[PDB]
């Protein structure tokens, strides 16, 4: 529990000499703010989309407007936001905009450079990517949400910080203002939002449904949910926005691996679209069948007509590991 | 870290049969929403402002619109928000509005019935107060912040949930709508917002500055900050929105107690007003821009304003608490 003023940035981690002024900015303000020199990009385990995959020091970007975008490739929220970021990079890179996609992993499989690179290609990311496998940059920036953006002006000062998915036009308007501050009289094309649709869902979807023993918050099944294998069964009645298991499953801090060939998952949700984050090679049947292979990622299992309360069952073939259910 | 859609309620605790649909509401929506029957008010250790101090069961309030208001008496955000709630209670009680202030304590001293009562008296609260000393209700409601509000319609269904300070008119508008839904044609006085000013600060103040060993996030003195008594000194340079200690101090998980006649705190903050939550009996000496002030400290621990600025800005100040005074935090306005 904490006190909060609406629109206040809910920063994580602690205060150090580099990030002490970040709290001087609010969460996604419509007007430019000023909250200190951008903290260093540190502990980056590797880079992508840069010459010889060499690192980029923010100080080398002075003179340009810089947008720091925190993401994770399997994150559905990030998947919906990134197209807007790609559009901005495309529209403004030749006008003074630099973009750095800081990839801070939510899961272990997101620490694999190859999986990340594959995810980026699918999203059309061409801008530099910094792998934040030790959460050093995420922590230095006092972030706590996916997606998250920090907008830096040409002098290296943070002028806008936005946590969460949505409100693209607010941010693009400030990016345009800063490009002009950096290069007075600069001529820019019409806003990228003109041709990039805002597909942000109403913010009342089922909470991210984790299967990791240590993160689980909505397992509506009777009875314990600890590590190791065991045989589960659906309860007489499952709570709304909750899930239950049927069959043999193996549970660990990462997720739930389908064991027996009878394993099944029942889910009561509230959304329009449903996605499952699964790893491994196998087949996934939903009550339709879907082949599962390659780097773990989101697989859409529900493409609804509208946002409403519904139920669905998923049968992961043995071997398939479920990390969570995300929504849209 | 977690995923988030802006305006999404960042609920806490786990999902149970009573609160499973709360996530169906967004954070402070301007239109009515529907997110399940209101969870039970669980494990309340005491009640104030009810006949015989007896408990209130939400089911007994069916037919009335019910506003659940989570607060803590020493919370400055809550202190600024409550006058709005008091205004609503006074304006709508006779039109069908029931209000319950669930007092979930942030500090141990806030669990004391008498301290809460005095805090409530100072704030003009005359509506029922439920002491949530074991956080049972806070948890059943999956709340995460002070202040927080849950608006329940006459059928006992939650239709609005708002976390944090601000946006009073959005909520009052829904309260009026629900009062009409409960009693179609009901006549209401003009909105309380008409006579109650919105004094919500810009949302860019120094974060709540805790002195508790397990909560501290902006101690810039450098070195160890563990529980026990020790001698401190100010660092060569103190970072913005941070504090440092000088002199002897005794630290624990509740706060920092002055343990000498030389104890002092230096604070770099970004706000207009500054308050210190402190307990014990003694005197507090504060110096801002070369101007000192002496403050007598006694009675229930609570907020004491140490700075009344003219505008929001980055500033520094020093506080020297007589030995024995316990500093819990610095909060802002």
Instruction: Note whether A199 and B39 are within 8 A (CB).
Output: no
Judging contacts by C-beta atoms under 8 Å, the chain A residues touching residue B200 are: 5-6
Question: Sign (positive/negative) of CA torsion B47, B53, B59, B64?
Answer: negative
DSSP H or E segment with residue A180: helix A168-182
Nearest CB to B28 within list A6, A78, A165: A6
Tell me if residue A75 falls in helix, strand or coil.
Answer: coil
Beta strands in chain A (DSSP E): 2-3, 46-48, 65-71, 97-103, 129-131, 145-146, 148-152, 158-163, 209-210, 228-232, 242-251, 256-258, 264-279, 282-286, 289-292, 297-316, 321-327
Q: Which residues contact B58 (CB under 8 A, 6 or more apart)?
A: B38, B40, B41, B66, B152, B156
Token pair for B263: 């104890």
Instruction: Note whether B98 and B60 are within 8 A (CB).
Output: no
Q: Which residues contact A194 (CB under 8 A, 6 or more apart)?
A: none
Token pair for A213: 């023993």
Phi, psi for residue B309 in degrees, rounded to 5: -75, 175
Q: Cβ atoms within 10 A of the Cβ of B253, count? A: 12
The radius of gyration of chain A's CA atoms, rounded to the nearest angstrom, is 21
Nearest CB to B15 within list A28, A77, A241: A241
**How are strands ordered across the β-sheet holding B158-163?**
B46-48, B129-131, B97-103, B65-71, B148-152, B158-163
C-alpha B264/C-alpha B270 separation (Å) is: 20
Q: Do B3 and A242 touch (CB under 8 A)?
A: no
Q: At what angle do helices A76-92 and A113-123 cross, to 10 degrees?
A: 60
C-alpha A15/C-alpha A304 separation (Å) is: 43
Q: Cβ atoms within 10 A of the Cβ of B224, count? A: 10
**What dotted CATH number matches B1-201?**
3.40.30.10
Instruction: Note whether A238 and A206 are within 8 A (CB).
Output: no
Helices (H), chain B: 76-92, 113-123, 136-140, 168-182
> Which residue in this structure is represented by tokens 């090679």?
A281
**How are strands ordered across the β-sheet holding A65-71?**
A46-48, A129-131, A97-103, A65-71, A148-152, A158-163
Nearest CB to B77 within list A3, A21, A106: A3
Q: Prior bond to A59 cis, omega within 30?
A: no
Token pair for B69: 């208001």
Q: From the CA of B85, how many Å to the nearest CA of chain A?
A: 16
Q: Which CATH superfamily is domain B202-332 in?
A: Galactose-binding domain-like (2.60.120.260)
> Which residue in this structure is represented by tokens 């620490």?
A111
Of all residues in chain B, the one with the smallest CA distance to A25 is B204
Closest C-alpha among A223, A202, A176, A182 to residue A272: A202
By CB neighbour count within 10 A (0-12 exposed, 13-18 middle, 19+ buried), where does A104 fall? buried
Instruction: Note whether A37 and A156 are within 8 A (CB).
Output: yes
Of all residues in chain A, the one with the smallest CA distance to B13 is A217
Phi, psi for residue A91 in degrees, rounded to 5: -75, -35
Residue intervals of chain A classified under CATH 3.40.30.10 are 1-201
Instruction: Note whether A265 and A319 are within 8 A (CB).
Output: no
> Which residue in this structure is represented by tokens 């929001």?
B312
Pick the CATH number of A202-327 from 2.60.40.420, 3.40.50.300, 3.40.1280.10, 2.60.120.260: 2.60.120.260
Closest C-alpha among B308, B300, B303, B293 to residue B328: B303
Bridge partners of B316, per DSSP, are B268
Instruction: Note whether A171 and A162 are within 8 A (CB).
Output: yes
How big is the CA angle at B280 (ends B147 and B137), to the nearest 5 degrees? 30
Q: Do B203 and A26 touch (CB under 8 A)?
A: yes
Token pair for B310: 């003219």
Question: Sign (positive/negative) of CA torsion A299, A305, A307, A310?
Answer: negative
C-alpha B291/C-alpha B288 separation (Å) is: 5
Model resolution, angstroms? 1.9
Of all residues in chain B, the one with the smallest CA distance to A326 is B3
Distance of CA A33 to the CA centre of its chain: 25
Biggest distance spanned by C-alpha atoms of chain B: 67
Q: Do B26 and A218 touch (CB under 8 A)?
A: no
Closest C-alpha among B106, B150, B140 to residue B14: B140
Q: Do A26 and B204 touch (CB under 8 A)?
A: yes
Closest C-alpha among B58, B161, B69 to residue B123: B69
C-alpha A309/C-alpha A318 separation (Å) is: 29
Question: Sign (positive/negative) of CA torsion B239, B243, B248, B253?
Answer: negative
Distance (Å) of CA A166 to CA A85, A171, A310, B206, B271: 12, 10, 25, 25, 28
Q: From the CA of A309, how many Å to the nearest CA of chain B?
A: 9
Token pair for A277: 């984050």
Question: Sign (positive/negative) of CA torsion A128, A40, A64, A67?
Answer: positive
- Alpha-carbon dihedral angle through residues B187, B189, B194, B198, given to the nearest 10 degrees: -80
Q: Write the DSSP symbol of residue B206.
A: P
C-alpha A150/C-alpha A29 separation (Å) is: 12
Of all residues in chain A, the one with the smallest CA distance to B20 is A240
Residues A42-51 as b/e (b if ≥16 CB within 10 A, e otherwise) read ebbeebbbee
Token pair for A270: 């509230």
Q: Are strands A321-327 and A209-210 parallel, antiparallel or unpaired?
A: antiparallel
C-alpha A235/C-alpha A220 separation (Å) is: 8
Distance (Å) of CA B31 to CA B141, B157, B275: 21, 15, 35
C-alpha A219/C-alpha A210 separation (Å) is: 9
Which structural technique was applied?
Answer: X-ray
C-alpha B82/C-alpha B71 separation (Å) is: 8
Q: Cβ atoms within 10 A of the Cβ of B91, count? A: 22
Q: Do B1 and A220 touch (CB under 8 A)?
A: no
Nearest CB to A14 within list B78, B217, B331: B217
Q: Do A5 and B201 touch (CB under 8 A)?
A: yes
Instruction: Note whether B264 and B319 are within 8 A (CB).
Output: yes
Instruction: Note whether A192 and A97 are within 8 A (CB).
Output: no
Query: B73: alpha, beta or left, given left = phi > 0 and alpha = psi -120 to 50?
Result: alpha
Q: At what angle do helices B76-92 and B113-123 cross, to 10 degrees?
A: 60
Question: Sign (positive/negative) of CA torsion B301, B253, B204, B88?
Answer: negative
Q: Write the DSSP symbol of residue A172.
A: H
Long-range (24+ apart) CB contacts under 8 A made by A119-125 are A119/A73, A119/A74, A119/A295, A119/A297, A120/A48, A120/A49, A120/A73, A122/A73, A123/A73, A123/A79, A123/A82, A123/A83, A123/A86, A124/A83, A124/A86, A125/A49, A125/A82, A125/A86, A125/A101
Instruction: Note whether B241 and B317 are within 8 A (CB).
Output: no
Residue intervals of chain A classified under CATH 2.60.120.260 are 202-327
Tell me if residue A253 falls in helix, strand or coil.
Answer: coil
Nearest CB to B206 within list A23, A25, A104: A23
The radius of gyration of chain B's CA atoms, rounded to the nearest angstrom, is 21
C-alpha A172/C-alpha A166 separation (Å) is: 12
> Which residue in this structure is represented by tokens 């309860």?
A235
DSSP string, A86-139: HHHHHHHGGGTEEEEEEE--SSGGGG-HHHHHHHHHHHT--S-EEE-TTSHHHH
C-alpha B320/C-alpha B246 separation (Å) is: 9
Q: Write the DSSP symbol of residue B238.
A: P
Closest C-alpha among A259, A257, A247 to residue A278: A257
Of all residues in chain B, the one with the smallest CA distance to A210 is B2
Residue intervals of chain B classified under CATH 2.60.120.260 are 202-332
Token pair for B189: 């006085």
Instruction: Note whether B146 and B77 are within 8 A (CB).
Output: yes
C-alpha B202/C-alpha A259 separation (Å) is: 53
Instruction: Note whether A75 and A106 are within 8 A (CB).
Output: yes
How many Cα atoms occupy the beta-carbon half-sphere of B142 within 13 Å? 26
């Amino acid at each position: 529990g904490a006190m909060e003023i609406r629109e206040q940035l809910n920063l994580g981690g602690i205060v150090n000499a580099q990030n002490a002024q970040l709290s001087n900015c609010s969460d996604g303000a419509a007007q430019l703010e000023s909250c200190g020199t951008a903290p260093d990009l540190k502990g980056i385990t590797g880079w992508l989309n840069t010459p010889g995959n060499k690192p980029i020091d923010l100080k080398s970007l002075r003179g340009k407007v810089v947008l720091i975008d925190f993401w994770a490739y399997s994150c559905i929220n990030c998947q919906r936001a990134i197209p807007h970021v790609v559009g901005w990079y495309q529209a403004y890179k030749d006008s003074g905009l630099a973009v750095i996609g800081v990839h801070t992993p939510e899961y272990a499989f997101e620490k694999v450079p190859g999986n990340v690179a594959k995810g980026a290609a699918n999203l059309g990311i061409s801008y530099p990517i910094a792998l934040d496998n030790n959460y050093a940059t995420w922590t230095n920036y006092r972030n706590r949400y996916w997606p998250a953006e920090y907008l830096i002006d040409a002098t290296g000062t943070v002028r806008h910080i936005k946590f969460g998915e949505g409100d693209y036009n607010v941010t693009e308007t400030l990016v345009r203002q800063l490009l002009n501050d950096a290069k007075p009289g600069v001529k820019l094309p019409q806003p990228s939002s003109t041709t990039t649709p805002d597909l942000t869902p109403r913010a009342a979807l089922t909470p991210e449904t984790y299967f990791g023993v240590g993160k689980v918050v909505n397992y509506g099944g009777g009875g314990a949910y600890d590590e190791g294998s065991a045989v589960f069964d659906y309860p007489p009645s499952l709570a709304a926005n909750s899930f239950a298991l049927r069959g043999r499953w193996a549970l660990d801090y990462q997720g739930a691996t389908s064991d027996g060939n009878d394993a099944a998952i029942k889910l009561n949700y509230h959304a329009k679209d449903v996605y499952i984050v699964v790893g491994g090679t196998g087949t996934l049947t939903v009550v339709a069948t879907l082949p599962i292979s390659g780097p773990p990622t989101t697989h859409q299992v529900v493409a609804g007509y509208r946002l409403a309360s519904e139920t669905l069952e998923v049968r992961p073939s043995k071997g398939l590991q479920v990390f969570s259910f995300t929504y849209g």
